[PDB]
Write a protein that binds this ligand. Sequence first.
Ligand SMILES: *[C@@H]1O[C@H](CO)[C@@H](O[C@@H]2O[C@H](CO)[C@@H](O[C@@H]3O[C@H](CO[C@H]4O[C@H](CO[C@H]5O[C@H](CO)[C@@H](O)[C@H](O)[C@@H]5O[C@H]5O[C@H](CO)[C@@H](O)[C@H](O)[C@@H]5O)[C@@H](O)[C@H](O[C@H]5O[C@H](CO)[C@@H](O)[C@H](O)[C@@H]5O[C@H]5O[C@H](CO)[C@@H](O)[C@H](O)[C@@H]5O)[C@@H]4O)[C@@H](O)[C@H](O[C@H]4O[C@H](CO)[C@@H](O)[C@H](O)[C@@H]4O[C@H]4O[C@H](CO)[C@@H](O)[C@H](O)[C@@H]4O[C@H]4O[C@H](CO)[C@@H](O)[C@H](O[C@H]5O[C@H](CO)[C@@H](O)[C@H](O)[C@H]5O)[C@@H]4O)[C@@H]3O)[C@H](O)[C@H]2NC(C)=O)[C@H](O)[C@H]1NC(C)=O
Ligand SMILES: *[C@@H]1O[C@H](CO)[C@@H](O[C@@H]2O[C@H](CO)[C@@H](O[C@@H]3O[C@H](CO[C@H]4O[C@H](CO[C@H]5O[C@H](CO)[C@@H](O)[C@H](O)[C@@H]5O[C@H]5O[C@H](CO)[C@@H](O)[C@H](O)[C@@H]5O)[C@@H](O)[C@H](O[C@H]5O[C@H](CO)[C@@H](O)[C@H](O)[C@@H]5O[C@H]5O[C@H](CO)[C@@H](O)[C@H](O)[C@@H]5O)[C@@H]4O)[C@@H](O)[C@H](O[C@H]4O[C@H](CO)[C@@H](O)[C@H](O)[C@@H]4O[C@H]4O[C@H](CO)[C@@H](O)[C@H](O)[C@@H]4O[C@H]4O[C@H](CO)[C@@H](O)[C@H](O[C@H]5O[C@H](CO)[C@@H](O)[C@H](O)[C@H]5O)[C@@H]4O)[C@@H]3O)[C@H](O)[C@H]2NC(C)=O)[C@H](O)[C@H]1NC(C)=O
Ligand SMILES: *[C@@H]1O[C@H](CO)[C@@H](O[C@@H]2O[C@H](CO)[C@@H](O)[C@H](O)[C@H]2NC(C)=O)[C@H](O)[C@H]1NC(C)=O
Ligand SMILES: *[C@@H]1O[C@H](CO)[C@@H](O[C@@H]2O[C@H](CO)[C@@H](O)[C@H](O)[C@H]2NC(C)=O)[C@H](O)[C@H]1NC(C)=O
Lengths: 674, 674
Amino acid sequence: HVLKTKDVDTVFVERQKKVLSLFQDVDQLNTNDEYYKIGKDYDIEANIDNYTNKKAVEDFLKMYRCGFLPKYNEFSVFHDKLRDEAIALFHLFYYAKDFDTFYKSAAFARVHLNQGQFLYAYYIAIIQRKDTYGIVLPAPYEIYPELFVNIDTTYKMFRTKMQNGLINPEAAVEYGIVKEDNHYVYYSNYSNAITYYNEEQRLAYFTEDIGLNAYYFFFHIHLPFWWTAEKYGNLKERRGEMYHYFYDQLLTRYYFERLTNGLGTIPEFSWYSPVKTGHYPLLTSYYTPFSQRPNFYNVHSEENYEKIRFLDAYENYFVQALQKGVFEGFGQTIYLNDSKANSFVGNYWQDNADLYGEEVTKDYQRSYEIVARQVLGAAPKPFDKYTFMPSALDFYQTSLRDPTFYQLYNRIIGYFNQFKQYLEPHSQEKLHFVGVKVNNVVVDKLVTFFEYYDFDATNTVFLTEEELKTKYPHNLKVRQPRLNHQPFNINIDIKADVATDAVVKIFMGPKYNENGFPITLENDWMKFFEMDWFTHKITPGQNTIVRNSNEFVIFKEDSLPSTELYKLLEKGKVPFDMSEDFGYLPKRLMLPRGTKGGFPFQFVVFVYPFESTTKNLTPYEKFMIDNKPLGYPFDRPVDTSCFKQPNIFFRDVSVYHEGEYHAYEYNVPAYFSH
Amino acid sequence: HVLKTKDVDTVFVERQKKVLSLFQDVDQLNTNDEYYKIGKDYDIEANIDNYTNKKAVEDFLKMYRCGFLPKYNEFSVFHDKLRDEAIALFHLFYYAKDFDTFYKSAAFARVHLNQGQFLYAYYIAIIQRKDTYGIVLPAPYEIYPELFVNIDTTYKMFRTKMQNGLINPEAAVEYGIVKEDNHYVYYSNYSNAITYYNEEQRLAYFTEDIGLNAYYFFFHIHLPFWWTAEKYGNLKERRGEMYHYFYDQLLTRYYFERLTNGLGTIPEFSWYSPVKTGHYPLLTSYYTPFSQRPNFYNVHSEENYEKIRFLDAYENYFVQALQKGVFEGFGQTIYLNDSKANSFVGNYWQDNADLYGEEVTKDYQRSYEIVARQVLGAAPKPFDKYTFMPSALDFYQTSLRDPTFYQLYNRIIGYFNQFKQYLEPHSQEKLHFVGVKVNNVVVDKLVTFFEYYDFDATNTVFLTEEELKTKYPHNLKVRQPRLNHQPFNINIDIKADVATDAVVKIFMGPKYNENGFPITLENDWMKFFEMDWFTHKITPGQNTIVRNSNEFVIFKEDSLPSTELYKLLEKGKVPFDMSEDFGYLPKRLMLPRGTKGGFPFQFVVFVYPFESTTKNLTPYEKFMIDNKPLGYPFDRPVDTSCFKQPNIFFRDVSVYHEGEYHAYEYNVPAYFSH
Ligand SMILES: *[C@@H]1O[C@H](CO)[C@@H](O[C@@H]2O[C@H](CO)[C@@H](O[C@@H]3O[C@H](CO[C@H]4O[C@H](CO[C@H]5O[C@H](CO)[C@@H](O)[C@H](O)[C@@H]5O[C@H]5O[C@H](CO)[C@@H](O)[C@H](O)[C@@H]5O)[C@@H](O)[C@H](O[C@H]5O[C@H](CO)[C@@H](O)[C@H](O)[C@@H]5O[C@H]5O[C@H](CO)[C@@H](O)[C@H](O)[C@@H]5O)[C@@H]4O)[C@@H](O)[C@H](O[C@H]4O[C@H](CO)[C@@H](O)[C@H](O)[C@@H]4O[C@H]4O[C@H](CO)[C@@H](O)[C@H](O)[C@@H]4O[C@H]4O[C@H](CO)[C@@H](O)[C@H](O[C@H]5O[C@H](CO)[C@@H](O)[C@H](O)[C@H]5O)[C@@H]4O)[C@@H]3O)[C@H](O)[C@H]2NC(C)=O)[C@H](O)[C@H]1NC(C)=O
Ligand SMILES: *[C@@H]1O[C@H](CO)[C@@H](O[C@@H]2O[C@H](CO)[C@@H](O[C@@H]3O[C@H](CO[C@H]4O[C@H](CO[C@H]5O[C@H](CO)[C@@H](O)[C@H](O)[C@@H]5O[C@H]5O[C@H](CO)[C@@H](O)[C@H](O)[C@@H]5O)[C@@H](O)[C@H](O[C@H]5O[C@H](CO)[C@@H](O)[C@H](O)[C@@H]5O[C@H]5O[C@H](CO)[C@@H](O)[C@H](O)[C@@H]5O)[C@@H]4O)[C@@H](O)[C@H](O[C@H]4O[C@H](CO)[C@@H](O)[C@H](O)[C@@H]4O[C@H]4O[C@H](CO)[C@@H](O)[C@H](O)[C@@H]4O[C@H]4O[C@H](CO)[C@@H](O)[C@H](O[C@H]5O[C@H](CO)[C@@H](O)[C@H](O)[C@H]5O)[C@@H]4O)[C@@H]3O)[C@H](O)[C@H]2NC(C)=O)[C@H](O)[C@H]1NC(C)=O
Ligand SMILES: *[C@@H]1O[C@H](CO)[C@@H](O[C@@H]2O[C@H](CO)[C@@H](O)[C@H](O)[C@H]2NC(C)=O)[C@H](O)[C@H]1NC(C)=O
Ligand SMILES: *[C@@H]1O[C@H](CO)[C@@H](O[C@@H]2O[C@H](CO)[C@@H](O)[C@H](O)[C@H]2NC(C)=O)[C@H](O)[C@H]1NC(C)=O
């Protein structure tokens, strides 16, 4: 298994090394590094001519002269002041006329501003600026290790750095601390191996997977809710569509993990009753432990009355719009069948900039999601604008760790899916592919297993004045057994009459509902996980297609550590996926953990005529190369019919799991010491 | 597989035919039957000299002159008036000087009294009277089909009888109605195939198994809570022990079923909060449907205020007694270490006759169990002393159907197990068998599966005047897939120093807790299901014991329908087990349904010195042939020690399940019509 690579020129390489020079030892400043001198004395005012937008720069300066979030404090985009500052900073980065002015602005920020705040605006700018297109971003877990690993292993790294090494390596092994080469390796367990407060803990290997969490972070920085989608041209008109697709797909995938663990559907809650599923983040900031929400949390308390009424009102509005058939307000009146209605509900639920026709949201345009994250996070109200007790719900990099995150968005998609039943359902004729028929589909054995995975966590530690004189160590390694599966083929048999360009899609869906009974397309159309999308020229007669799971376009390879990125740069290359598909879900997670006896699911292949791609979303996500609605044909209900189309095939499938069932078993000292 | 038989003489054979003559078409009277003429004119008063207790007879006559529960009304021993009348009836039967007087009294009852009331006292008298010892009892599901099969199938039988056969056999098949020979067979689903109101429904194949339920009914009539245990001699002093053992074992067996179904530990509840798991009995009486308790039932309502205070007080008394190290009241002072302590707590929790040192319980001796069943049953207060809306908790034959049954007794055994930690824990020395060592234990593959089981359900129907002139039809058969498992051997390897008489016990226990983590003997000693108990002579050197599951003494063969009993009688024979082990749990249920991949458990063999059997309980249950406390050595905690005793062995074991996972699949017309 070789990783696909891509060729880059000398300019790109030079810009790549520059951006990476600002992603090192992020919680500390190195006066020996070139960036410190540049950044410390950069005069934004004096170079105001090197920015395409003078107003944005002046607003930044005006804001900056008043002070920004101090260093070391936690930064969260869900807090007004912090967000506005971060956004002003983003504008300073985005409007730099050229890479050089941008780099200097970045260095300025790195030296003067809050590390978290800088990293946030930095990450987004690299994604948004045209001149940095293709630039490979370092893994978020490598940049925010304190957000991707529990305190028990963070504390072990702290103890190692404080002791300046291992004092008794033979004893350290019993605490998962091993030395390999010149690296210190830390075997890190998911939380279900240290605390089991509720049954949802059984899903910890999935909800705490660094790749899954990185995936949500990438989703957000690819296109922040506070920013307009203008830059992406077409996506703007299809933004709400993308919202639905992303969350439906994520919720459905999470649902599958629940199913193979016997946890049933995503729980429903009320803002007027205790929230059943609590959550205890084993994370910490530099000033406080993350807030905890005990099981059966009394959410309807005096501190949340007003917020709950707002959330209620927000839901009420939508439900009433569905009833009367029209969305009023926001400067327009949309009937449910309007051609922009789909984008409206999506933008409405997310309360994004595009809902208002602006480039950035304002503080007074209150958000359902932000307020809901606030009350579900269970944190006491902020001490002040710059100080708050964070919860898993305050970061896109830790959101998926909280069971209520899925419950919140499942509630939202719940309404979105209700809205979809008011639309014209897909007719049997529009779904039919005259001349095309799928005679059979055979799927190879589906097997999951846990496999060790390492990543650089050195950013967890603080370097010595002497250590800063020499090259960075990239000394610490965090090792966790992560979910994965064996590659598998899908053999498709297609009997055709005429020759035509066809599109073939591969989905994965449940076979039974939570109670073990047969699924129903009428109520379960939204439970199909899109796995593949590709064009294929169908020749008259017999057509045999073989798609290997490693080829599914929906997923990407694991990221490589910054150190391997450099070696690859010497060759004038960059990982293909890491550069162009950084937002895709890691392929090692395309399958939910199976069971020893094999858990029931079904694959489905659908092939339809290839045609218009005039309003595709390639500038956003590469695989979106058609005009059909995202998730087609499971994007909305379908005109109930008891006789399936010949161009769609459903194949039963079983997901088995090999090796140790529980991930923590691979971190038992007796085991890894062999 | 041949069923063990037993030889019986002419006297026995004649009495067996007499007792069975009163178990036919029980809801109807046959004036053509000999018993009718006998019973209709039998004069109890005139024969008073034929009973060994004249007071008992006069009390029955005095009571009977005021009236008894009318025919067709539902009978339940949990209602005062009904119980008192039944007990008087039981005394009339128990004190008959000889079988003939007994028979005539019974015939009198069958003609004049409420069917259910009669069957109840009849069943018990047959078990208690010395001259009827060994008499075979008909299966309870054959006598009370309307309490062992849901109404959907009962209504089908009614339809068949009203039509006097099938009007369209070909159509009837699609509804589970089939004709085989001269029988009408009805495929009957467990409730989870028709309504899935909560996750507990997943357990319906077990909680509704007719054998499991019959088992509870037999436990009761064997020795009612309202009767003293005097007749059984030693049982009286060890009654409490027997109470703990019966329920703990049953709760543990049920816990195993939850485990392989991902349902965790037995839920805990509060009398002051909504009861989470509801229950919908798909049963009916002749006047009303059974009462239903919806999920999240508001149990703390004005109707239950006083009852709940009584229940709370009952529990407080016990908790405080434990805290102060002594039980006070009920005519004595018992410190926790008193030899009479164990029986006191069991008799206290059951509020039985022996708690008071009386023959039978009185109306004012309020029962925790009866009141708890009253409020958990959720039925509205009784219309009057003879009329009430029944719940599954009003019958020993339907109790195991209701999830709260296990929650109630789990709560009670929880208190019993807390009491046991105040006693002297078995020391390692007493557990040690000097010179005996179990080197190894090997268990054959553990495999479960569903298999069709039939029983006579003709009592569900009413016969015609003409049909009554001829022999009873035994026309209707109920067919259901019931749990079962393949036979398996356990090879025990023992290394002895000298020769001795040893006792060997076999238990099945969980391997992991509900969260999937290792079990702990300090906290899970009460979770070991006793499977076998037998004496074996040990010779010096190497010993090898091979026990087949069909040999385990704790279980019994399934019961035979009454028609088969007659045929066997012609040869002067009766089924061995049905005769003297009717109270045992059906062996086809000794193993919980497994999983396709195999669910983890562990078998443990323990061998100790065979000695004293002075206070054994053979008169009650055959297998209780020792002096040791029931469930030894897991009858109480053990002096925690990380080093295993040589004479005890634990072996990991996996229970797989073959064929269809869901029982209802075997009742699908397309399936059984082949
Ligand atoms: C415990 O607990 C407690 C309780 O809580 C606490 O306390 C707290 O504390 C805190 C802290 O400390 C505080 O705060 C702080 O304060 C301070 C002071 O204040 C004041 O003052 C100021 C100043 O003044 C001045 O200036 C101005 C302008 O701007 C003017 O106007 C005036 O006049 C003056 O003048 C002067 O100036 C100068 C001096 O400085 C010179 O030039 C001369 O001298 C002249 O003359 C000011 O500004 C203020 O103001 C305010 O206030 C007032 C009243 O009072 C008013 O009127 C105003 O308006 C204002 O106010 C307000 O407004 C509003 C309201 O309505 C709001 O917003 C608020 O409130 C405000 O405030 C006063 O007066 C100060 O300074 C500081 O600041 C800082 O921080 C912040 C945040 O926090 C920011 O924003 C800013 O920007 C700053 O920053 C900085 O720092 C930090 C730390 O802290 C950091 O992180 C950052 O980064 C930065 O850094 C920088 O700086 C520093 C110093 O400062 C240095 O050091 C550094 O350096 C480094 O680094 C670099 C890089 O970057 C390198 O290169 C090097 O090398 C190294 O070295 C840098 O440079 C703050 O704010 C408070 O207050 C308290 N609270 C209370 C209640 O009290 C404590 O802390 C604790 N403790 C423990 C231990 O934990
Ligand atoms: C709708 O809804 C409504 C509402 O809920 C309902 O109503 C109800 O109904 C019911 C039912 O019907 C009712 O009840 C009833 O009533 C009746 C009447 O009463 C009256 O009367 C009586 C009687 O008297 C007499 O006797 C005595 C003695 O014992 C004396 O003393 C007197 O004087 C008299 O004498 C006379 O008469 C006689 C006749 O009888 C003769 O001998 C001569 O003539 C002389 O002179 C009485 O007892 C009563 O009393 C009472 O009351 C009073 C008041 O008024 C008082 O004072 C008293 O004390 C008494 O008691 C009381 O007490 C207490 C109080 O505190 C309480 O506990 C209560 O209250 C009581 O009451 C009167 O006066 C009656 O009779 C009836 O009875 C019956 O039943 C029961 C149960 O229920 C029982 O227990 C009994 O025993 C009886 O039984 C019977 O019947 C049944 C049915 O019913 C059955 O099941 C059984 O088994 C039995 O049977 C028998 O008999 C019959 C008749 O009756 C016949 O028929 C039969 O036949 C058969 O048999 C065999 C088989 O087994 C064969 O063999 C043959 O063939 C066949 O036929 C048998 O025999 C009851 O009780 C009520 O009341 C009502 N309620 C109201 C509010 O009103 C309705 O019903 C509905 N409907 C629908 C449709 O659903
Ligand atoms: C009054 O409200 C209107 C609309 O609600 C505001 O107009 C918007 O202004 C923003 C500039 O911040 C534009 O980006 C939008 O396109 C405008 N939308 C509409 C519908 O006009 C207007 O700014 C408000 N009045 C004032 C004085 O600000
Ligand atoms: C008052 O109550 C006491 C206690 O319940 C009764 O005493 C019992 O009497 C019976 C005689 O039938 C004895 O067998 C018991 O051993 C006694 N128990 C105790 C604790 O003493 C007493 O009989 C009752 N008195 C009356 C007049 O009914």
